[PDB]
């Protein structure tokens, strides 16, 4: 109903925070962040890539398969007859 008032009931939690001025926009964003980028990227790339392979394969597979099938009329039947 009333959005902030009545949602849940919660007791004996404590919270701490600072003025945004009190702290920095990039607390080692570069150094400390780069590992975090890496670690989780693999958890996905396990389950992400495998299909993308398949298309590109088939993509070229059919591409070639398409090409010679079309490209060369005197391929199987050459122009002796």
């Amino acid at each position: 109903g009333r959005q902030f008032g009545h949602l849940t009931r919660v007791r004996h939690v404590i919270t701490y925070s600072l003025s945004p001025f009190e702290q920095r926009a990039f607390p080692h964003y570069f150094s400390k962040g780069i590992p975090n980028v890496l670690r989780r990227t693999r958890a996905c790339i396990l389950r992400v890539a495998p299909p993308f392979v398949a298309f590109y394969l088939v993509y070229t597979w059919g591409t070639q398969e398409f090409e010679k099938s079309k490209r060369k009329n005197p391929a199987a039947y050459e122009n002796d007859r």
């Binding site: 009333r2 902030f4 008032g5 919660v10 007791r11 925070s17 003025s19 945004p20």
Partner: protein, 160 residues
């Protein structure tokens, strides 16, 4: 009731936006503490606040010498008031000594009162209020209480 001069005591009785509140001052050796302490319904919290920032902020700009006087008189009374009785008289000295030394500048306090001015209060509050970083303490059922980032933007008016 609702006819009191204090805008807070007028509204907070009117719509009972809080149960009660009082403002404190505590000045340490090097430090001082200005703020209030209020109690209001778990659904009434926000509205107490949006009011309370009204008063401080409006003082820093638009305040007026009239209401100065009604404040001026009271503090004279409260000052003179507390001064009765053995122990409190006795008691001032000790801290005062540990604070200002012997100084019990009794009649001077009055002279000190005559010092304060409309610009003064504004110019003073301009320092210690306008666009600052306030501290926030809370005790449940808080949840309604807005996030800091509101309060912060809520310190400095936009001119509204």
């Amino acid at each position: 009731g609702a006819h009191l001069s204090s805008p807070l005591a007028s509204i907070a009785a009117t719509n009972k936006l809080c149960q009660s509140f009082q403002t404190f001052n505590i000045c340490y050796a090097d430090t001082g503490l200005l703020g209030a302490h209020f109690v209001c319904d778990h659904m009434s919290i926000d509205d107490m606040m949006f009011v309370l920032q009204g008063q401080w902020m409006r003082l820093c700009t638009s305040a007026t010498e009239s209401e100065v006087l009604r404040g001026k008189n009271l503090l004279r009374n409260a000052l003179v008031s507390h001064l009765d009785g053995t122990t409190p008289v006795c008691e001032d000295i000790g801290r005062s000594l540990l604070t200002y030394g012997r100084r019990i500048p009794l009649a001077e306090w009055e002279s000190r009162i005559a010092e304060v001015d409309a610009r003064v209060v504004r110019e003073v509050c301009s320092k210690y209020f306008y666009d600052q970083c306030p501290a926030v303490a809370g005790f449940g059922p808080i949840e309604q209480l807005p996030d800091y980032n509101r309060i912060r933007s809520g310190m400095f008016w936009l001119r509204f």
